[PDB]
Amino acid sequence: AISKNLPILKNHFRKHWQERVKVHFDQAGKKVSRRNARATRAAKIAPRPLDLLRPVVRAPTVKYNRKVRAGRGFTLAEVKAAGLTAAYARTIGIAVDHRRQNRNQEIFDANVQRLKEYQSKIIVFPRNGKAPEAEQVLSAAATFPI
Amino acid sequence: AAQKSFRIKQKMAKAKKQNRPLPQWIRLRTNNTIRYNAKRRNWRRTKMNI
Amino acid sequence: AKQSLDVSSDRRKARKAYFTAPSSQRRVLLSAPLSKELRAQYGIKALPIRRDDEVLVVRGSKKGQEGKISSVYRLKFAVQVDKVTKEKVNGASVPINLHPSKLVITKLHLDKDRKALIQRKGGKLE
Amino acid sequence: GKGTPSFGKRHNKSHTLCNRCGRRSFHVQKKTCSSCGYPAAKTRSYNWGAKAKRRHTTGTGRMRYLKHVSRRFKNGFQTGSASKASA
Amino acid sequence: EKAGHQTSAESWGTGRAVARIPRVGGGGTGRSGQGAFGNMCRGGRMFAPTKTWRKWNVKVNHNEKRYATASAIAATAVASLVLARGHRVEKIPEIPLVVSTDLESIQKTKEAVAALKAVGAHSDLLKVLKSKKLRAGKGKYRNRRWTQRRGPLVVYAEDNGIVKALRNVPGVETANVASLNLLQLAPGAHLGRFVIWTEAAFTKLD
Amino acid sequence: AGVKAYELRTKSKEQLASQLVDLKKELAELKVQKLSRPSLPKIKTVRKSIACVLTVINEQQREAVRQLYKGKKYQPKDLRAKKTRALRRALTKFEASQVTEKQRKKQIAFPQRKYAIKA
RNA sequence: UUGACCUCAAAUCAGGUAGGAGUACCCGCUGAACUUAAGCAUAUCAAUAAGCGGAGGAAAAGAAACCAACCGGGAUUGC
RNA sequence: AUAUUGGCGAGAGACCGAUAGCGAACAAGUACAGUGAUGGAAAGAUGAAAAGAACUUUGAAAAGAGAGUGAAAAAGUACGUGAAAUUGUUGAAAGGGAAGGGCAUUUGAUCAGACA
RNA sequence: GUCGAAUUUGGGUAUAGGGGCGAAAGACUAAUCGAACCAUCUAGUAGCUGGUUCCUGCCGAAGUUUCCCUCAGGAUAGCAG
RNA sequence: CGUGGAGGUCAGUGACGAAGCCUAGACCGUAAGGUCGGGUCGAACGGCCUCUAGUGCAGAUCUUGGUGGUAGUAGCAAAUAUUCAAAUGAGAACUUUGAAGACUGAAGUGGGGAAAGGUUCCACGUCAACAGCAGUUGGACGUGGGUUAGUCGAUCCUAAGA
RNA sequence: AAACUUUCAACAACGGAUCUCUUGGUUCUCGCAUCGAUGAAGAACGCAGCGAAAUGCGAUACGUAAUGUGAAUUGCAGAACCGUGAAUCAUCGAAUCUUUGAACGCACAUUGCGCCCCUUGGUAUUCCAGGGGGCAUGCCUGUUUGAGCGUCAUUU
Numbered sequence A: 001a002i003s004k005n006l007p008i009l010k011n012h013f014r015k016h017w018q019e020r021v022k023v024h025f026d027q028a029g030k031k032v033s034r035r036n037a038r039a040t041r042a043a044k045i046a047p048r049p050l051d052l053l054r055p056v057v058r059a060p061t062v063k064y065n066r067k068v069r070a071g072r073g074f075t076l077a078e079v080k081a082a083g084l085t086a087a088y089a090r091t092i093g094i095a096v097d098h099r100r101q102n103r104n105q106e107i108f109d110a111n112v113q114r115l116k117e118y119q120s121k122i123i124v125f126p127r128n129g130k131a132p133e134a135e136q137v138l139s140a141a142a143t144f145p146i
Numbered sequence B: 001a002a003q004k005s006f007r008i009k010q011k012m013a014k015a016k017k018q019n020r021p022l023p024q025w026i027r028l029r030t031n032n033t034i035r036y037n038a039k040r041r042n043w044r045r046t047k048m049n050i
Numbered sequence C: 001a002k003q004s005l006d007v008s009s010d011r012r013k014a015r016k017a018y019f020t021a022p023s024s025q026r027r028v029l030l031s032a033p034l035s036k037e038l039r040a041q042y043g044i045k046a047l048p049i050r051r052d053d054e055v056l057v058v059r060g061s062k063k064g065q066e067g068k069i070s071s072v073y074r075l076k077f078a079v080q081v082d083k084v085t086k087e088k089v090n091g092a093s094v095p096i097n098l099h100p101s102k103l104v105i106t107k108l109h110l111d112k113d114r115k116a117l118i119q120r121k122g123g124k125l126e
Numbered sequence D: 001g002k003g004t005p006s007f008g009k010r011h012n013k014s015h016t017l018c019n020r021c022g023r024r025s026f027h028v029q030k031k032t033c034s035s036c037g038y039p040a041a042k043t044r045s046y047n048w049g050a051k052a053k054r055r056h057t058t059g060t061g062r063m064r065y066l067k068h069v070s071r072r073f074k075n076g077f078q079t080g081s082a083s084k085a086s087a
Numbered sequence E: 001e002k003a004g005h006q007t008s009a010e011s012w013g014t015g016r017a018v019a020r021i022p023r024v025g026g027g028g029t030g031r032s033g034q035g036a037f038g039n040m041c042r043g044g045r046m047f048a049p050t051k052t053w054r055k056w057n058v059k060v061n062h063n064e065k066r067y068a069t070a071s072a073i074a075a076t077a078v079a080s081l082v083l084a085r086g087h088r089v090e091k092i093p094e095i096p097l098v099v100s101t102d103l104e105s106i107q108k109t110k111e112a113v114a115a116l117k118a119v120g121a122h123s124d125l126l127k128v129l130k131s132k133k134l135r136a137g138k139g140k141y142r143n144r145r146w147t148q149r150r151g152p153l154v155v156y157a158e159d160n161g162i163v164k165a166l167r168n169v170p171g172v173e174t175a176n177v178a179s180l181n182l183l184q185l186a187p188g189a190h191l192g193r194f195v196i197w198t199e200a201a202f203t204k205l206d
Numbered sequence F: 001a002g003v004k005a006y007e008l009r010t011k012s013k014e015q016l017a018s019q020l021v022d023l024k025k026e027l028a029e030l031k032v033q034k035l036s037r038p039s040l041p042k043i044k045t046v047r048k049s050i051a052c053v054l055t056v057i058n059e060q061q062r063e064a065v066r067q068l069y070k071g072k073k074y075q076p077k078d079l080r081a082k083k084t085r086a087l088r089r090a091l092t093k094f095e096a097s098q099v100t101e102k103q104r105k106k107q108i109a110f111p112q113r114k115y116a117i118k119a
Numbered sequence G: 001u002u003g004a005c006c007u008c009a010a011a012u013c014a015g016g017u018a019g020g021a022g023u024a025c026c027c028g029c030u031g032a033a034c035u036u037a038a039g040c041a042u043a044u045c046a047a048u049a050a051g052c053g054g055a056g057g058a059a060a061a062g063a064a065a066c067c068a069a070c071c072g073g074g075a076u077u078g079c
Numbered sequence H: 001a002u003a004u005u006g007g008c009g010a011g012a013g014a015c016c017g018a019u020a021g022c023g024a025a026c027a028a029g030u031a032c033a034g035u036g037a038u039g040g041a042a043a044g045a046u047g048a049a050a051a052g053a054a055c056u057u058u059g060a061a062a063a064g065a066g067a068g069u070g071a072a073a074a075a076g077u078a079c080g081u082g083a084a085a086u087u088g089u090u091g092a093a094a095g096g097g098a099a100g101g102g103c104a105u106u107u108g109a110u111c112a113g114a115c116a
Numbered sequence I: 001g002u003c004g005a006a007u008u009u010g011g012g013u014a015u016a017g018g019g020g021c022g023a024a025a026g027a028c029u030a031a032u033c034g035a036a037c038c039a040u041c042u043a044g045u046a047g048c049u050g051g052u053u054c055c056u057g058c059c060g061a062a063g064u065u066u067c068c069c070u071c072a073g074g075a076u077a078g079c080a081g
Numbered sequence J: 001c002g003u004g005g006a007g008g009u010c011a012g013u014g015a016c017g018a019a020g021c022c023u024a025g026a027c028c029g030u031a032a033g034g035u036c037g038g039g040u041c042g043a044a045c046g047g048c049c050u051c052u053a054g055u056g057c058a059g060a061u062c063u064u065g066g067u068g069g070u071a072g073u074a075g076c077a078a079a080u081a082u083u084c085a086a087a088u089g090a091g092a093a094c095u096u097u098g099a100a101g102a103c104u105g106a107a108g109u110g111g112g113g114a115a116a117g118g119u120u121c122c123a124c125g126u127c128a129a130c131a132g133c134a135g136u137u138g139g140a141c142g143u144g145g146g147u148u149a150g151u152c153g154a155u156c157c158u159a160a161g162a
Numbered sequence K: 001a002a003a004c005u006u007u008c009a010a011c012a013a014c015g016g017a018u019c020u021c022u023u024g025g026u027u028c029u030c031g032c033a034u035c036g037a038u039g040a041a042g043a044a045c046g047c048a049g050c051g052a053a054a055u056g057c058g059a060u061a062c063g064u065a066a067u068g069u070g071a072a073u074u075g076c077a078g079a080a081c082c083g084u085g086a087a088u089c090a091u092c093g094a095a096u097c098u099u100u101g102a103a104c105g106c107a108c109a110u111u112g113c114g115c116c117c118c119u120u121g122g123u124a125u126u127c128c129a130g131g132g133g134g135c136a137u138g139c140c141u142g143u144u145u146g147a148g149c150g151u152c153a154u155u156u
Ligand SMILES: CN[C@@H]1[C@@H](O)[C@@H](O[C@@H]2[C@@H](O)[C@H](O[C@H]3O[C@H](CN)CC[C@H]3N)[C@@H](N)C[C@H]2N)OC[C@]1(C)O
Pocket: H043, H044, H045
């Protein structure tokens, strides 16, 4: 069971592995099934953007600290510095994360600016009548990249 | 047996009724595939198992 | 071709669908075409056949014969005409089964409903 | 001895007909059906028994009720009745 | 996978004068006492039973794919290949055939079929319909019943309705220039398909 | 011939109960005929009618007792909705949508606001 | 003498509810040996088969007693 | 978002093609076996249409021989095609304790091509 | 051999698989007993036995070295394509 | 070389006969094989370039089904036993009736029951199969008829036990 | 020389290969979320002018009500339209739904055996028979009704 000059392999199929095979035949099937169910949210969701506004964030560790990507939510500190309540900023399609903290002025500054730029680029439909028909934009993060 | 539970007698009644050949007019029906009654039964051939 | 995702080109599903179809579904399968003169009269190409209709065999051995349809035999997918018959060697005679798609309607049997159906299809009705 | 002559001795029922499954798996003395498990509150089945499962599960019977459920649901369990149209 | 193993049979073992494949239990049915499980047995499981995890799709390098189509396109010129491929092009004006962008807007089969015929596609449009045959094989159970040749590929730039116009004429296929399908450009991996380029299309090429 | 449904649903409770004994009595006479005769398909239609009579007799007394029980808690099970055993236990539309006093004030002050972007 | 209170019962009391079925997928319990190791006991098969309890259209999980060690990240599940 | 060899409804395949494919394309979990738990088959195709063979005749009859129907009975409810083993008749040839085989030729049978 | 008793016997009833029952034979426990029968784990493992399906062309072996709870097997070198 | 299927092609072959089967008939190949004639038949099928695999059998005490020689053979010989006439029928060693010869010899080959079977009972018809000869006979086939309780049983009671 | 044997062919046997068929199976994908004490799954036994079975059904029994279609059903017999109407039709919302089964008055190798309310009958609250409606268990909220020197006040 050991012969010629070959790497040792550790080929792990000693359980009943044929039971736990998972093949994706639905790769295509599910891409469609989830494309409809996206565009059927874009309707039921009304002119709303289909996603939530996300913060600038410095990536962890030493490998990715060099970079930055969208974080979860906006830090009550920034929600107040941009001048709105959190509980309201939830319903403006801003994501607010209460766990995040600001140790960085440069990131805190960057994120407040990103917040006002959104308040400026949005139109909030009033409680009752009107609705000056607004033609929904499909992303937020595309409008507001990083 | 020959002092019978009616339960046993009744299964034994239903026995007799299935014991007749094909009614031969079914043979005539359109589409009809049944040549003969292939579920037939004999007292001394095969037994009823109560 | 079929563009609907609810239509099936499966040959098996169709052949079963046909042979399993019930009475009410078979009547519409048993459509016969209206005569050239009857097409222009009613403005309709074809209708599901009916018992007392009059009809003309346009295909087969009996092509050129015509008569009143004795029965529509739905079980057999066959329409029987009472003129057309075969005589056995005992000297009796037996209907010839005919398929409406090989017939053509000279004279409809008109009902209030058969009349309604023609106008309901956009017809004329003399 | 253990053969055919000893077979002349067999006239006694270990099992009569089970009321629940109508089998003759109902052990007279144990008074419990070796097939469906009656008297037991539940119905005897086992996972090494796939065939006998298949022989008895829902659908081997009339489905005197369950037949129609799938239809009643398609219609959202309409109550009342239907009115009229034409012809 | 359940199939063929659906008995309880087991070998009778040697000494009973018959071979040792597993054998069905019980009696009275005549299935009993018969070779079971065996890849040589009536009813037994087949050797190496087929699996859904067989490798079905095949990966190709993107650039290799594009190289292929590229070479296939270049053969829609080069008349001999198009001729050698079927495709009765011996009388058409020139290779490649480029056609007025107005083609893209045709709404009606008769209209479009004309334009095709007009511009040299008659003999090819007609090569199909003569080429219709019943499937030689057993696939004709399986919802491929009919053999036929392949007619021209009408490559438009924007589709204004040429596409629903040609979809019912046989052997004819329509495709955008932004997409292009090697399956059509080189059918059965044979070079030189017959392509009718709307002049719109032709300049989107570069 | 043989009985019509809507012509029964007119008649009085005491007429129907009488015409029932008719059809039974007609059917009884036909039963005695049928063993003297090589076949008697007639019996099919009398006894199919003894059903149709009985359907209506029952139809009434149900839609009768259905009426006096109308619009009150606790009426009898077979006049109670069938639905599904599991739907029968569902939380009613009222007690699902029952919201919280604390939470009610918040849905009010802070509802999801319609909105869009690009301008 | 009476009337409470607490606890405990009884009614074919008023009205509800649980059982069983199915069990591919799901939450748990319990639980092998064949086998592999060219022997074999730890180990492996496998926290698998079998047995048992409990669900739903999904179940479960979930808004950190988290991960990190960074300029930090930020419920859960999935690829 | 994730799972799904159960359910209900659909669409499909470089799948199998009646010893294959689920065990079951058929009155299949059927017939049948076993005290019982359980075990568990075989078996699709006349024809477009019964037109399923009037009638005569031989026979106790089953049938046969005719006649007839049919595009075909070289399709007759033993029913598409109908191989092999193996069997009857007929024809041909040969055989002193096997049969068959190889090179070669006489003899017979048989088949060309090929002259012009 | 025995034959009026530690007799024969029906039926009911109890005991169930490392269990039963045994006036003891490893006997009997449904033609099964020095561990029943049914199904499943299970396509259990086999250094051992048997088989392993078309044609032609060219090349063409080894039973020896070292190691192995190795001596009917492998590893290794050699010969071979 | 050959097989199932797949993309392409020859606008391939075919109800004026595809496929298959038959054929000490013909031809090409060293060979796997390929082509042709004739016969039978009835509805589909081939050449080429490629794609693909559940792709080729003489064996495995291989699986399933079918069939031989054995072979008109081994045999159909325990339980003393059969014989005459008539009837019936196409047909009688076997059915029916009469006559006779015998047996079981009331610890029965008699007269009933329990368990078990399940209609075998009984009448009419009736012989393809079954009754290892036969068949006019039958426990067979067909078709009908038949099981009558305050007192006989169950039911009630309790036994071991559950 | 025959027979017999063997070999080849034709015809005919035997068997059911091959070929071609396919309302089946198999695999993939998509959508959906609905069993039951309001009695399910499952059983048994019934039901048709002429049925053994498969299928359907439940003593209203191959079906009743409702709705749609618009003339059948068909194997025979039988019945039978310019219409509240054919059909072994479609659909289905209303019912019937035997003996059962978690299975519920008790039992059940028994068509065994009680109790309660209404009602008819034989002179009948009491006995006999018919008709109908009823009595399982655990638990919960509640209602009556109680128990205990467990304990509170109060009467005299
Ligand atoms: C070779 N293909 C055959 C095909 O020829 C045909 O075979 C039939 C066969 O089904 C018939 O038999 C059938 O009907 C019989 C009725 N008595 C009973 C047995 C049943 N299989 C046989 N009588 C004649 C064959 N040629 O049907 C079956 C099949 C296997 O497809």
